[PDB]
Amino acid sequence: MRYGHFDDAAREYVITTPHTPYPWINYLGSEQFFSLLSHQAGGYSFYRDAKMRRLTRYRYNNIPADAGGRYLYVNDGGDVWTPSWLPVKADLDHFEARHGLGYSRITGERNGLKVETLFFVPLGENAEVQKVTVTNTSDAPKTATLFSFVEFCLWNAQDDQTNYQRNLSIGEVEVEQDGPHGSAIYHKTEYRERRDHYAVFGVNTRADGFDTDRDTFVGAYNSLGEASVPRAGKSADSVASGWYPIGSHSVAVTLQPGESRDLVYVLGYLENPDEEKWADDAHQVVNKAPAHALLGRFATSEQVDAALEALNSYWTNLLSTYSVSSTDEKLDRMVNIWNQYQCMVTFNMSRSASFFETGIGRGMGFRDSNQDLLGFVHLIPERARERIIDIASTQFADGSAYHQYQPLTKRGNNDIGSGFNDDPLWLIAGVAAYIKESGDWGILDEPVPFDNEPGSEVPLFEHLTRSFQFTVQNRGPHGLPLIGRADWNDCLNLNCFSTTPGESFQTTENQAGGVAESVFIAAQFVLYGAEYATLAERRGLADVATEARKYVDEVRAAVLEHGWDGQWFLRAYDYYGNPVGTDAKPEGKIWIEPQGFAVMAGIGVGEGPDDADAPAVKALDSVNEMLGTPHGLVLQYPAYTTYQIELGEVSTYPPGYKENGGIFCHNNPWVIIAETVVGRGAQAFDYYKRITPAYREDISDTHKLEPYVYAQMIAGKEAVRAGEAKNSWLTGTAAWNFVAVSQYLLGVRPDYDGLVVDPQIGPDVPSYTVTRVARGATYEITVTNSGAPGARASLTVDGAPVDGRTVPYAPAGSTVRVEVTV
Amino acid sequence: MRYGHFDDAAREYVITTPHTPYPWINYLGSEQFFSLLSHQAGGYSFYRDAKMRRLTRYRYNNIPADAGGRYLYVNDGGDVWTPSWLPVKADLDHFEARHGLGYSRITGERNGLKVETLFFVPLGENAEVQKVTVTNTSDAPKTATLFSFVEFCLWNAQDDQTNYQRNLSIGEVEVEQDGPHGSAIYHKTEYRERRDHYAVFGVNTRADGFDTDRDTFVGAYNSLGEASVPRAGKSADSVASGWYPIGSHSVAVTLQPGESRDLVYVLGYLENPDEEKWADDAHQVVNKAPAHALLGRFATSEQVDAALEALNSYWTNLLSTYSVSSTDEKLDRMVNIWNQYQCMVTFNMSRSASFFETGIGRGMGFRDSNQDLLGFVHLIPERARERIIDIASTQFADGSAYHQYQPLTKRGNNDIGSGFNDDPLWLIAGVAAYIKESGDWGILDEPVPFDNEPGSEVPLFEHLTRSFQFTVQNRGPHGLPLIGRADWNDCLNLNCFSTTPGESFQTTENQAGGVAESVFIAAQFVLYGAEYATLAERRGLADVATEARKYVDEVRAAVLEHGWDGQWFLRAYDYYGNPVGTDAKPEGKIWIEPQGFAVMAGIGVGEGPDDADAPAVKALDSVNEMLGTPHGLVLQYPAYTTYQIELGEVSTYPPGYKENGGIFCHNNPWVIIAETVVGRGAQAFDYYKRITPAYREDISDTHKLEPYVYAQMIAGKEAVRAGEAKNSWLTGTAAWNFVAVSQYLLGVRPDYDGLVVDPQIGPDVPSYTVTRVARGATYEITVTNSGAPGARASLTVDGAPVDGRTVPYAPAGSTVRVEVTV
């Protein structure tokens, strides 16, 4: 089963039926303004922040799913339909939805009218634009009225959906039928008070009618599928006062056979300095200058196509830094297009707003946005540079950090907990990755506040020493790091012991004391402590570097002395000091996280893939056997079947789901990289294939979700629904697979001083070429690959043989041809 | 005009069309279990706490409104319909909804098949019961299938609405097709862990089939109104695993012409003690003992009827305590049934869960639940007694309090703000009212903790002294009480100065300092300090009482000096000591709260109703001219047309709505009572009628909301929607209007030592009789009423002339006959 196909030439996914297993979305915009856009035009838009500045209302968990978006009702001689199929569900002669990069196109044809909508967010603009083309595809003339429709949200999404006792009375709008480029509608709830911003809804022609009151346009007792106004065939010209404000214009068109007409709609977010808030001395009329400039920049189809061409170019630019041409076009489309696109989206959204993330509780995660950085640095480094400052700015002086920050304000909060002891180290991971990529050492000197305190600024590097010190100065009785609230795994709450239902494990108070330690954070420390060590050394900090190395080696000794179960790695010591993820317990015998990560840190590695005696190999073989499924690798085994009070949230999920035996795809790339480390490329590629969008399109009815982007979790072998994903789009899997495949499978990764070429992918990719731009030079890396296990590359550069696998960076401007033999 | 009518004998309101102006609801239950039920079976049910143990999902702001409740899909030969109309919307031959006391009947008939559901919550039972009666009305034998449907919520409604990322994976059910009395379905999400409760949907017969998974039942791309399973005619026997759990049973019926059948369905809430959660060693199967028992008690129709008779007897004898017979039947039905009914509801719910209050943020409001008491103490005083203890236990040692408390835990919180300086005195009001009613002086001796601290208990009376001292020790420069965040008027935030959009006025940081005082709190102090002094006096605290009246005298003097604008009472002094509520200003010249409240406390009363020199008469006329509308009195005049940054939230509402120029019904009865005090019965009675459900039934299309219960706000003169209510059901209006009418218009009101009989209703009720049980005696009060302005009663009691208007309380069991002449 498949519901559409990739089109590589156009960089689109093409959906060919509306009857998908679930709503399938694209993210529009990439700067400050965003739209979630389903293949039925469902979703919503926000400026910068989904909780705080949401422009349009969308209902999660509606019946049916995704009824509510940017609809255009067509009334053709009494018959009413929508080219997005939903909400009217009228029969379509032709239907198509194409999700592209920063844009989508939805086309729907019925009874001789074809309606095509191009949705996108233009570069530099805080607006969503639709170019709608109506074509008469019959033998006879046609008259039709089109009704645009969109539903306003009242800005604060939290208040929107809970605070009716107030907010049913505050909705305001202005209507401008005779504006400079056509008709506009103004949503300005609370602009009267503290908001310095409003939304506009406009079309590039003088409208026949409008409507701004939902109840009037839809009618008592009706769903959107049955809206009264389009059925009536004419707008009611409703002005909202309180209740539910909408945006809606009506446009009657007449077409001869084969003729078409373009309509351009803009939903825009505008601000005014409060000096210029009002058109009038009495402050009753919003100043509309910005709104008229916006509509004037999109008054014509030529203007639209120009912006769309510019957007195409920007993508081409972004995607030119890394790419691959091989014999496997599923690999190719992932590395060249889809995975990098996702990374851009995750860098932007973190984990706040998907069709599963509700854009309310979660803002920008510390761990989440640091990790995303690893997949974003090659794309736009200047923006990664800024983001690093932003994250570091929510760090506390003692080295710990706010678990997340509010995107609109950049100020951290505790809304989803505090005291995650793995957080602080990810800062070093982000910065290491960024420096390797850019070589912009001047970042370590950037002055950066603690918890945004002005006056408190220290150099970035110093922030890093705090992170490093935090874990140094918080170790338990085996010398493993103290776990605190949780580690990378939010659901392993060893300091919790909750028996009060309905209070969240992420926010509920924690027990002081006990001796709970994390093998994960230990691994984490070994990996990133080495990065930190290497940066101390380079900044000329001799002794700090020597000291850092001593600690790193201690934590590594500890992992091997106290963190080893026999055939795999322990996960943790609980509050009482008892082992977790041991063969001693009947459930939760083996956990994936420390297996993946300890091996990337190099802990327990023998002298080859064929050294059955190395902890690293045993670990991965236990993982292979206990954790392996056709759909990826489950998190631990067996899943817990009763509530384990000492472990927190983990055993609260039914077996096979989320952290209780789900495939948490995010951690699969840790094993994939681990495998290349021990030199079993063939299997690392296997693993990559099980979870990767292009390899799973074939089972779209099983995966259920978008077949072009990774999801956070795939139901595991203990789940009745084994193989079905949830929480698509917004996941660290994206950036971690990008790292995995671009840098470890195919082998091309920047290091401090040169570019490493270390293919480890096994025989299924016998030959490829990578074009990598680094430090302004193009590297053309041409690989011949036997994929023999353990075999490792040798290189020639411009005709000359060199040693090891690191090509010192060539000056900017140069092209450097690398011949690779594995 | 009208959409149904009252049925006085049946104690029901009868809705005769499904096409009402807005969903009109009833509240089932009066103990700890509750159901919101619209006249289309829409709504939901919870246990104790609508945020925390919500059994069934419901969507606010759904398109259409109210698509979601308890549904019975009838499939008659392929043709599908619902007797609630919604969701399916088939044409009915007849429809009817009867809203009764603690139950409702909904009937729909279509093509020879009449389905009547009776809904209710039984006494002592944590369940909602449906007695379905399907009757063949054709002259031929008929066959059909019935599909019951309820949608489960995941207990924590806030989480349910926001946290899909977690909760889509924790839905969990059990199916019991062959239990002891029929088929049952068990919703058991998170019973696996910390929840000791599950839910049951069962029917008193063995069902042909079942469904527990929403998507299977409803179908993809379908709304409730197009549910797949009913249309297919067969259940699908789905066993939910995560996603959306539902309860549904199919039962096949066959009816001879004129024959009928009863099915009994039960939605119950059960709990096991910990050592009894599981049926099995393994802990995978819920112990069903409690649910078998519940389903057992509703196995037959006879048991249903009995429980309904018992519920009818509970209402008859709650309503025996206060009753009127008069020449105005609208007044009678308000007093004898509806106003009382509503007070039970408010007492139970505070402002927590309506079809407007979403049952998330609001719990049991300190201010609101104290005021509910005034209208509830005569119904079940023991429970009022408990409520005072619960409330007072959330007070702090300085006499300030938590603004509200969480219903499930009874522990106070700051979720909707802290430091509202009007809060503390309300506690005196409630306790005064309780003691006048019952004479249980021993309550002042009840030991009561502060903010629930073990060891902090003082007697209830000391809590009273802390509230009294809070105002005396928190006066500002004019000798008026400092205002804090706000007083009774939540939107008057004089210590705010907010420019940040998004942040709540209720919940944002206040400015330190400034000299902001409330005239309202002054009037409140004068009234309730007087009652405090009386509580001192009875307890022998003459030095406390003496000193207390001193302050009352001081504060009273300060209202006349510094709180008088010339023609009416000043509202406040802002952070800067500027008058607020003055004729000097262009907007908000006169605010209604101080006018009713001051005069209720006697401030500015003179010769009587025609002492034009008297401030109180000056004040009340101003109210009449400047605030009056045919729909009630508005809060201030003129409304604010731009943001007044120094007043807080009030100027943020568009003119005419809520606190900014809406009719805030809660405060009209202050003015009613005020007029009866001054002696203007006619105007008092006129103001009563402008806002009373009975008197507004004739303008249902304009009021839009339930015509049998007080709403919170009716759009005022300055709104385009003038006359349209919002926020029905949950409002202090119910308590305060019952006080007004039962106690000051009709004039029968308990005092500490006897029953005060002081009619002041004017000429439109020339004669009436009140029946009143008070401390175990029955007073039969016959009233002959001239209505002459200023004219007040003289009584003869059991044949004997008596002095003044107080009848000292007779023994328990006596019947005292009081003949009243005004």
Ligand SMILES: OC[C@H]1O[C@@H](O)[C@H](O)[C@@H](O)[C@@H]1O
């Ligand atoms: O707060 C975010 C966390 O919520 C937990 O309940 C989920 O199981 C985790 O997947 C997630 O990391």
Ligand SMILES: OC[C@H]1O[C@@H](O)[C@H](O)[C@@H](O)[C@@H]1O
């Ligand atoms: O927190 C509850 C309060 O919210 C405010 O926004 C409303 O205007 C008030 O009417 C309400 O009392």
Ligand SMILES: OC[C@H]1NC[C@H](O)[C@@H](O)[C@@H]1O
């Ligand atoms: O708990 C595991 C994983 N869950 C999903 C969260 O977004 C991520 O931060 C966390 O690491």
Ligand SMILES: OC[C@H]1NC[C@H](O)[C@@H](O)[C@@H]1O
């Ligand atoms: O003025 C706000 C007023 N209405 C809304 C609240 O229910 C009540 O507590 C308050 O007194």
